[PDB]
Write a protein that binds this ligand. Sequence first.
Ligand SMILES: CC(=O)Nc1nnc(S(N)(=O)=O)s1
Ligand SMILES: [Zn+2]
Length: 259
Amino acid sequence: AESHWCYEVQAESSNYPCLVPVKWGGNCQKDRQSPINIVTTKAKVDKKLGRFFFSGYDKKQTWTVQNNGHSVMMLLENKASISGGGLPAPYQAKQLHLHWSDLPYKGSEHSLDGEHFAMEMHIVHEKEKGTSDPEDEIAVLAFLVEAGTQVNEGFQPLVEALSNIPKPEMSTTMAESSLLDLLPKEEKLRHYFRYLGSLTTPTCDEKVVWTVFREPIQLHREQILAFSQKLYYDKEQTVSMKDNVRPLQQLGQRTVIKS
Ligand SMILES: CC(=O)Nc1nnc(S(N)(=O)=O)s1
Ligand SMILES: [Zn+2]
């Protein structure tokens, strides 16, 4: 490529040339890409999609959180894992990160029935393989975030940490907190959508089994704004981190199923 990959907002907000999403390389131009719009009434029920088992999600830890230049990322270091959820194996948690905007009607990568949410949180896990790379090497759990007036206390350790990592490659330690602190109530997580796709940043490898939960996380408008107010794409701090969102891709001949 002739320059570093970026999101559209970065190219629009700076005179420094970068490669916008439609121009991304790697596998980004192949035909099983993510994110997608989900028509919820067209997704077929698959009874084999049962409940998830979240392991290590309840435990209070002091997570390392970092600005990687295109998101904020918690390092999960195999300290959590998942099974069930119609998955073919257990998966080890690697990192958690987010995509957002600063307007309530956009910020998520996926849309449900043409509606974008204020943020989307991705928990990235790796497959525990056997002897028999695969289409489902990575399991990403996607949670949509709806802006409101409810202060989400569970999110405060993360939101407070943001002031400490404004620039790329900066890391800090979050106050004691659990992954469940960040999620909707567990019982609400029985309803989710499932399809096979890609990572949503270069090289956009087609190795992700996606889960998009129906239940949104409720976050106060100003907790969401704290992301774009405190974070930057560059050490120069010329472009606030927001609209770190890949445009919608075509489902093509794929099928979306639901629990
Ligand atoms: C470092 C790493 O895990 N790569 C990721 N790239 N895109 C991802 S996402 N947005 O689809 O969850 S994760
Ligand atoms: Zn992501």
